């Protein structure tokens, strides 16, 4: 009645106070992303004590005491003066939405109104402070409260809103109704060679900027897109569209035995061999039983240790799904394996 | 470039002299089955030193110095006088055929004529000492050189000849050409309720004896049948028929979350919960992704230790194919993952 | 060149930010004693990065940013309102003096003026705020800055000032010179049956209060007294007198094979078997070659895990001394084993 | 109620059948010494199941079925033809005497007449087949049944007969009475520079051959002599004489922090650093409380793994004595710690 990979992640990456630590940065940082991934994993494992401790740390240290009052700062860690505090008070909306979803599903599944209330206040603040109306698209999720919107252009991160989370949020009405449809546009229209970009810009009156560009590559952010798509229920119509769109990533992984590290989104030119977390991300995405067992072998023989936050969380998501640690319903709800 | 489950099995179950030890028996036995499984696993791991050591011990201690001269004795262990020697000189043909196949495929893949010579001499002797012509069937593989054939009846063990091995042996002509077809008959015609029996008798003029009987149950022997069927390539025409015949075993494991320990073959009534090795045996057999993931979780969280020979060898087979440790071609050859 | 027991203590008990955590208290506390023991052990291990991290945390969280400005609060942990802060701002002078000694010896051995400046300021403040003149004795070290000196009743803790630390501090003049002498009086005059008390009172015009009393027992605080005596160099003239005074503790441990949990100081009656850390504390204190080995075997076979802060630090001191992890010179300096 | 180092030694070095395996040798050998050390350790550990298993293997495979009928072959392992059998049927008298003592003390302590009968038969055969009268000495223990006694040049090994065993055997009368004395002569008269030789010759008239020679060095055999001396009871008159004779070995180890690998017995010149087993052999021998703890640290931090039979059995003897796993009485009996 435990999730062993989650138990090891707690022992190596989560402090006694409840903060998720990326040991590879010299400042030993916590991100709102890491906190939200801890909350998700604790929910899926039915680990309410860990959920509460992580939530407490998040509220006290990223949100000045309350997620009902402000979106969490995305970056926390050690300053030069030996003090540990917020390093960047801007938000990161992938952290924000995973937090809000985890809180709402914890409130529903553990029958705790407090979680529902916090997750509701959080989601409404996401809608009012990070969602904006983009001419030519409609409502769109910005990657953060500031820095991604100009007068005539906007920058988006396809990995930030999993289609299952978007489906779930539609129950709360606008703007999530529209976001479920504009998120599908973001995923399907920005992969001209079958690879989703880490980052992509949209300009008023012109559309997506898909000419070759430094951050228009499929690497560490975008590897999650394929994973989120793999996690969709087979009865979701968008799933087949999305799997067909990204088929060249699956094809590459099948032919070479590994996912690439970086893919030029405009040319489809691949470089490097992705780390173990990328192979974990391929487990829900790949549909052939044999190609899946190649990635399943690579994850099992190179399982991340304590020096690799991002490989470990990618493995929690991808290998966890591979072992039925959680599922998503047709309404985007958690179907727990408790 | 190692198979970790296999390396652990070597360290906990195989002596320095190359004998595979079942620790649960007070006589600390070795079987021809265990030796053949060790040879198979060593070939699949590309572990030629282990293979040579285990073959040496087999020839010296089970075959009085040569598998070319006699089928291996099936049971070796400690006698009451403190001496360690053969306990039963009869053969077990599942060990015999796995030995023969492993020797032939090692000769081919490692380009070593000695292995081919021993394997061919072994297979020829199997054909001449344990295969007999049964009125109503044709050539049939007996479970053992003696004790399974009377004047008008015979007793068979469906688990002994995996279809991929039978397909491989056809290349050597008769009787293996016929045995490939009569093995299918043995598997398909003795499972009236969708469950294969550990043991089943055939009487001249009467046919299969499928009335309820103590050993006409699907338990520790017959669990391998499903696994062997799961390991057939999809391009094998027999595989669809066999999967369909045994669908009630899959259906039970999907609905309940575990394979059963014992199923009455005449009624289909099932009892108990099978050990972890049975869940491993289900991994190649189950076609549903979710049911396959449930069994995968059970194998991962209850992986066999040093006190469970049979669960471990079933996990080597079942979890090893789940992780692409070996594949069988359409002609029954080893497609190695080296 | 590492100290494995210390490496394991860091991984199980010291937070990334440098706080030493006692997991057995539900508030997950840090004490000034824990911080000072971590500083000592990092110095002994030649672990300067750990030393700096622990020092930073101590200054920021126990000393409002600076050990030059105040003695550290002795108790920090989780409050009922979910925040983490000082729980009791009173000092504990055992942590204070271990911290000062460690800083001064770090300054000397690592040639860092900053450690010397902090240690000197801390030691001078200990003199000003915790040392008082007691009629009949002279200068005396109080267990803390408030609560231990009343109308005519002072309360002292014999385990607080190890004779080697007192020797080291004499280099700074008064009150440490005379203190070295009053500490000997405290140790030698309050053990009428050969056992040192956890706590003992001195009353004006009456003297030591040595009538049986709840806290006049040799238990969890006092076990350190024997250890500190065992750690004195054989060339310290006080050593032989103390070993003779405390001989009944050694005789008990030798005759019974374990140290007692609780001894009535007034009568010598012992109750219970001390935990593993008590056996580690006996290692420097014993002088036969047969009793020591018995205690060594108990520590080796019952080595503390992750749920046992006090057993673990007692083991770092006593087993670390038993493996030559540090020595004390005749002047109380660290003779490091780097 | 287990001896953890012995439990691990069984798991890594002792086969299921009960043979002690040296893994460094390509023939994976068992020696009579290894079997005797396994028997001793199992007795010390009160592991009667291991003792019986090891004794069974010893009798069946080194003594053609019975230690009552012949001394054990000293060397057993794999031949080039792949079979496993006796490699040298000559004896090694160190294994012989440890096996005899262990059987006699198992018979006495476990009240089992069978062990006494076998041990007595073995000891009387040792006297008949390996003990000879040497002009100028008297009865002497040869290192083996054949090859160590010629025209007038006998060869002896000072490490073979521990003084505690010689004391124990005196209870059986001649030749063990005088032997006890000539063994003292051998140890005290062949170390002119304070170091005992691995091997030393004696010639009629000319006496001990103590001029420098390739085998007249203190190395892997002779390291045991110091350890056996250290294991004598303090009330044995011979112990102080032997400790004084061998003072230079203790002085070297104290001054340098490690025992040497090889010492010229004629000059006292030392070379190299002895492996961890030599440090363990110094634990009973070294008499300071602070020297006995540098070596203790070296054993703790470099504890032998699975690839180091000799270091491991030296550690079982030396660290086991250091932890009170066994003691010897003034009559050479086992004082068990059970």
Residue by residue, DSSP assigns B4-35 as HHHHHHHHHHB-TTS-B--TTSTT--EEHHHH
- Hey, which residues 284-323 in chain D have their CB within 8 Å of chain C? 287, 289-290, 292-294, 296-297, 300-301, 321-323
Tokens for A293, please give them.
């067992």
Contact yes or no for D297 and C4 at CB 8 A: no
What would the two tokens of residue A38 be? 């801890």
CA A156 to mean position of chain CA atoms: 13
Q: Which residues from chain A sit within 8 angstroms of residue C28, using beta carbons? A: 16
Burial class (CB in 10 A: 0-12, 13-18, 19+), D49: exposed
List, as ranges, residues 18-57 from A with C-beta within 8 Å of C. Answer: 21, 23, 28, 56
Contact B170, B180 (CB under 8 A): yes
Q: Residue B110's CB: how many other CB atoms inside 10 A? A: 14
Class of domain C4-336: mainly alpha
Task: Count CB-CB contacts under 10 A for residue D326.
Answer: 20
Do D and B touch, counting CB pairs below 8 Å (3 needed)?
A: yes
Contact C16 A16 (CB under 8 A): no
* Backbone Cα Rg of chain D: 19
Return phi, psi of residue B91, to 5°: -100, 160
Please report where in the chains the tokens 């009085």 appear, as a residue: B64
- Closest chain D residue to the Cα of B15, Cα to Cα: D15
Compare CB distances from D84 to B17, B59, B82 and report the shortest one's residue.
B17
Is there a catalytic annotation at residue B205?
Answer: no
User: Would you state the structure tokens that stand for residue B322, as one six-digit string?
Assistant: 């789940």
| CA–CA distance, C299 with C296 (Å, rounded to integer) | 5
| Phi, psi (deg, nearest 5) at residue C298 | -65, -40
**Contact at 8 Å (CB) between B107 and B333?**
no
The answer to whether B288 touches B214, Cβ cutoff 8 Å, is no
**From edge to edge, which strands make up the β-sheet containing A217-218?**
A217-218, A260-264, A270-273
Q: Is the distance from CB of B245 to CB of B191 less than 8 angstroms?
A: yes
Residue pair C179/C169 in contact (Cβ under 8 Å)? The answer is: yes
The residue whose two tokens read 């079982």 is D316
Judge contact between C222 and C199, C-beta under 8 A: no
Q: How many CA atoms lie within 13 A of D135 on its CB side?
A: 9
**A2: how many CB neighbours lie within 10 A of its CB?**
10
Say if the Cβ atoms of D293 and C324 lie within 8 Å.
Answer: yes
Rg of chain C in Å (alpha carbons): 19
Set of chain B residues whose Cβ sits within 8 Å of the Cβ of A301: 4
- Contact yes or no for A15/C57 (Cβ under 8 A): no
Q: D82 to chain B, minimum CA–CA distance in Å?
A: 7
Using a CB-CB cut-off of 8 Å, the residues of chain A touching C60 are 82-83
Contact (CB, 8 A) for D41 and D1: no
How many beta-carbon pairs below 8 A join chains B and D? 24
Distance from C-alpha of B14 to C-alpha of D28, rounded to nearest angstrom? 14
Tell me which of B12, B17, B22, B33 is the catalytic residue.
B33
- Helix, strand or coil, per DSSP, at residue C278: helix
Cβ of A290 within 8 Å of Cβ of B323? The answer is no
Please name every residue paired with B14 in a beta bridge, in sequence order, or none if there are none.
Answer: B20
| Chain C residues with beta carbon closer than 8 angstroms to that of A16 | 15, 21, 23, 28
The DSSP call for residue A240 is H
Kindly report whether the peptide bond that precedes residue A76 is cis, defined as omega within 30 degrees of 0.
no
Cβ atoms D298, D278 nearer than 8 A: no
| CATH number at D1-130 | 1.50.10.10
Residues making up chain D, counted from first to last: 338
Fold of B1-129: Glycosyltransferase (1.50.10)
Residues in chain C: 338
Q: Solved by what technique?
A: cryo-EM
Cα D248 to the center of its chain, rounded Å: 21
Q: How far is CA B60 from the centre of its chain?
A: 23
Cα separation, A286 vs A333, whole angstroms: 22
Q: How far is it, in rounded angstroms, from Cα B313 to Cα D93?
A: 44
SS3 C218: strand
**CB under 8 Å to D144, separation ≥6 — which residues?**
D74, D90, D91, D92, D93, D130
Residue D293 Cα, gap to closest chain C Cα (Å): 5
Q: What are phi and psi of C162, to 5 degrees?
A: -65, 140
Whose CA is closest to B222, among B273, B283, B164, B265?
B265
Question: In the C/D pair of chains, how many CB contacts fall below 8 A?
Answer: 33
Are D and A close enough to touch, i.e. 3+ CB pairs under 8 angstroms? no
3-state secondary structure of A294: helix
**Pairwise CA distance, residues C35 & C76, whole Å:** 11
Task: State the Cα torsion C11-C17-C20-C26 to the nearest 10°.
Answer: -100
Written as six digits, the tokens of A32 are 């709102």
User: Sign of torsion, CA D317 D320 D326 D329?
Assistant: positive
Q: Say whether C201 sits in a helix, a strand or coil.
A: strand
DSSP states of D236-289 as a string? Answer: -HHHHHHHHHTHHHHHHHHHHSS-EEEEETTT--EEEE--HHHHHHHHHH--ST
Q: Which chains are within 8 Å of D by 3+ CB pairs?
A: B, C
Q: State how far the alpha carbon of D93 is from the alpha carbons of B94, D97, D333, in Å.
A: 49, 6, 20
Collect contacts of B121-128 with beta carbons under 8 A, ≥24 apart. B121/B67, B121/B68, B122/B67, B122/B68, B122/B71, B122/B96, B123/B97, B123/B169, B123/B172, B123/B176, B125/B70, B125/B71, B126/B71, B126/B93, B126/B96, B126/B97, B126/B100, B127/B175, B127/B176
**Chain A contacts of B290, Cβ < 8 Å?**
324, 327
Separation between Cα atoms, residue A58 and residue A35, nearest integer Å: 7
What are the b/e assignments for A230-266, b being 16+ CB within 10 Å? Answer: bbbbeebebbeebbebbebbbebbbeeebbbbbbbbb
Q: In what order do the strands lie in the sheet with C207-209?
A: C153-156, C200-203, C207-209
Q: What's the CA gap between C52 and C55, in Å, rounded?
A: 5
Chain B residues inside the 8 Å CB shell of A296: 322-324
3-state secondary structure of D34: helix
Q: Which chains touch B (3 or more CB pairs under 8 A)?
A: A, D
Contact A294 B327 (CB under 8 A): no
**D78 contacts in chain B (CB < 8 Å):** 17
Q: What are phi and psi of B319, to 5 degrees?
A: -70, -35
- Residue D116 touches chain C, beta carbons under 8 Å: no
At how many Å resolution was this determined?
2.7
C278 vs C290: CA distance, rounded Å: 17
Give the containing element (helix H, strand E) for D93: helix D93-109
Neighbors of chain C with 3 or more C-beta pairs under 8 Å: A, D
Catalytic member of A94, A96, A198, A236:
A94
Residues in chain B: 338
A29 secondary structure, DSSP code: B
Cis peptide before D175 (omega within 30 of 0): yes
């Amino acid at each position: 009645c435990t999730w062993p990979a989650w138990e090891q992640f707690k022992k190596d990456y989560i402090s006694q106070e409840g903060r998720v630590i990326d040991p590879s940065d010299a400042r030993k940082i916590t991100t709102s992303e890491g906190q939200s991934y801890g909350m998700f994993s604790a929910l899926a494992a039915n680990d309410r004590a860990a959920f509460d401790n992580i939530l407490d740390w998040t509220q006290n240290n990223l949100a000045q005491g309350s997620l009902k009052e402000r979106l969490p700062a995305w970056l926390w860690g050690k300053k030069e003066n030996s003090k540990w505090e917020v390093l960047d008070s801007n938000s990161a909306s992938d952290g924000d939405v995973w937090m809000a979803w985890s809180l709402l599903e914890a409130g529903r599944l553990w029958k705790e109104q407090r979680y529902t209330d916090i997750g509701s206040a959080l989601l409404k603040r996401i809608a009012r402070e990070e969602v904006v109306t983009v001419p030519g698209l409609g409502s769109m999720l910005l990657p953060g409260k500031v820095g991604f919107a100009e007068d005539n252009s906007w920058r988006f991160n396809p990995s930030y809103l999993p289609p299952t989370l978007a489906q779930y949020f539609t129950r709360f009405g606008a703007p999530w109704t529209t976001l479920r449809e504009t998120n599908q546009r973001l995923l399907l229209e920005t992969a001209p060679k079958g690879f989703s970009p880490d980052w992509v810009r949209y300009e008023k009156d012109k559309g997506w900027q898909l000419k070759a560009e430094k951050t228009l590559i499929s690497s560490y952010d975008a590897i999650r897109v394929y994973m989120w798509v793999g996690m969709m229920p087979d009865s979701d119509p968008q799933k087949a569209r999305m799997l067909n769109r990204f088929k060249p990533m699956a094809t590459f992984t099948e032919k070479n035995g590994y996912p690439p590290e970086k893919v030029d989104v405009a040319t489809g030119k691949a470089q490097g061999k992705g780390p173990v977390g990328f192979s974990a991300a391929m487990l829900p995405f790949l549909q052939n039983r044999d190609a899946q067992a190649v990635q399943r072998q690579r994850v099992a023989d190179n399982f991340p240790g304590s020096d690799a936050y991002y490989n470990y969380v990618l493995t929690l998501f991808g290998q966890g799904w591979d072992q039925h640690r959680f599922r998503f319903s047709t309404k985007g709800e958690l179907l727990p394996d408790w």
